Design a binder for this molecule. Sequence first.
Ligand SMILES: [Cl-]
Length: 523
Amino acid sequence: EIALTPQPAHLTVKDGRFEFGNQLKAKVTPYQGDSIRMVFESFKKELQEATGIKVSSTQKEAKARIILDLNPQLPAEAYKLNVSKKQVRIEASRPAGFYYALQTLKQLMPRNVMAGVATSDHSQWSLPSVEIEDAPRFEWRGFMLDEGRHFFGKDEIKRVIDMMAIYKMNRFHWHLTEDQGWRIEIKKYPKLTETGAWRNSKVLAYGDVKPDGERYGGFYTQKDIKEIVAYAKKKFIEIIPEIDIPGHSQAAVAAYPEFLACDPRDKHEVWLQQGISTDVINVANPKAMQFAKEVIDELTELFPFNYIHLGGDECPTRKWQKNDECKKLLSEIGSSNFRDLQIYFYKQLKDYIATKPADQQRQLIFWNEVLHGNTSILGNDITIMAWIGANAAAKQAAKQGMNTILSPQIPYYINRKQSKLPTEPMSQGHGTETVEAVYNYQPLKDVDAALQPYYKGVQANFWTEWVTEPSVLEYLMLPRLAAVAEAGWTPQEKRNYEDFKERIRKDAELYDLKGWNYGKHIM
Ligand SMILES: [Cl-]
């Protein structure tokens, strides 16, 4: 009957049910300039769409069948939800807490409510009596989509946001730039999208698959970006842009080779292959430095969240070793290790950001390869996204006083096959990254108590070398996304895969109402 995902920290089931009727009154705290009333108004619209129930306002506790009260002692995303025959009572300290209480309230109702779809026939509406106290284990509960390899577009990304929101995920990491495409309009550099957002193959070549000649691509205008940011904010999802530099930058190099290429006399094209490119940005070129500053400036206007991801994964130094500007810069920073140029490039950008007014400053996230360099100049107010040797990298980050986010390739890359069946779509892996394998990863296993404060959370990543169509994206995303969401939210002691399996089965109905694809193996 009751199926909540993520499982709350504390749930007690009580006798009886709360019945709505067609109309009822709510009393809602005015905290923070009526912000909670605004959250509640959004909820009311959803509820009416799905059920026909109308909620009006009251100031009188005695008339309130739903009450949202401020409890400042609760954590920033925590809530209490008490459902009795007489009243629904919610307590929280911050808008996100109240929003999550209402997510859990929706999830206690038939699945059409969470889906935001009315039922064909006439229905009766109620809640089970419960006492819930809930709070997320981790503050960062993320999903990353690669749109550089294949582009999905606004409608599909809204569906991604919708999926994340079901499971209380709060961080969308937008991997917008790659060797094979650049997907975000930058006004000062129009060729990033004019050249970089189109290429002459849909498939990315690998093994026996060759380029297919199709004029393929797409990008987001700044208007598009602002729309998606606003859409996600309504669901308490913040967006982190990733401009992956100076590696994974062949599309940018193809757009502006005259100053971004290490070897501008050679040819530079958007890459049609899968793999790791050596065609990295010439970090020693002054126009490359200005380019990066100017891109960051435009990101700052589009993305209000306080973090930017600069990537830094899989960045070969060989083209720097062969470039005169780079050799000279390395000599001038007193080094014989070309990796240091990557760190210096970042230091310039970090310094630049520090010159800006406080509200324009951003904190930086990097893939963990950056930690292999001498990062001392960057200080410890950077964040390491741990993916390769993740457990060890996160521990090293924490030991250096850096925040860390866990996105281990195994098992949190949910583009990978989720079954060994021969009928699975083509993607990376053998089929070992089953729902169970995802759920069973324990992020803080054997992590010393003193390091744990630096572990900000977890993220599932979705790489799109092989994935070109929304149906396949969704098939691979779901239901593994929910396992990572639960890992991010639910206390480890309350996590149980067989229990999760029973609960997630109830969401097939939700997925079907929304027309989402999903793997059916555990269903
Ligand atoms: Cl754990």
